[PDB]
Design a protein around this ligand. Sequence first.
Ligand SMILES: CC(=O)C1CSC(NC(=O)[C@@H](C)NC(=N)N)N1
Ligand SMILES: CC(=O)C1CSC(NC(=O)[C@@H](C)NC(=N)N)N1
Length: 130
Amino acid sequence: SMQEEDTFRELRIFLRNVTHRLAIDKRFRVFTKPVDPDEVPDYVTVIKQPMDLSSVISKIDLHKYLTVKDYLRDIDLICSNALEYNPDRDPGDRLIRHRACALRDTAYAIIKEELDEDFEQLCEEIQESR
Ligand SMILES: CC(=O)C1CSC(NC(=O)[C@@H](C)NC(=N)N)N1
Ligand SMILES: CC(=O)C1CSC(NC(=O)[C@@H](C)NC(=N)N)N1
């Protein structure tokens, strides 16, 4: 229905705002764009399902997220991919892991503070009826 489409549009507006706030954070610059194959060639090999904040924005605009849970699974994927690609004790790897975990923590904290739980439940119940 029209009211249901209004609900998903409000969700997209909210998700764009969260994603923008993550993308402008200097700590998260390494996650804003796909990994460039030149600067690092083994990434395409190790990481089967790449995700970054620019791809998240594209999926929002393609109406791919109908719930907050669909969105956070892609935030979770940005994080888990970074931990998998950077497992070593060396400081370069450790720095990316710390930033990845901070990105995930920040997104969850924004949603916990600013998303009404009844709004997320509505999105869920609309989606379960489709
Ligand atoms: C998005 C992501 O996970 C990235 C982007 S650059 C990076 N890691 C590195 O440049 C070094 C520190 N570690 C390697 N294993 N090459 N990890
Ligand atoms: C997913 C993962 O590997 C981890 C390990 S610890 C973490 N986040 C934290 O400890 C946040 C909540 N606190 C900080 N003072 N940083 N995330």
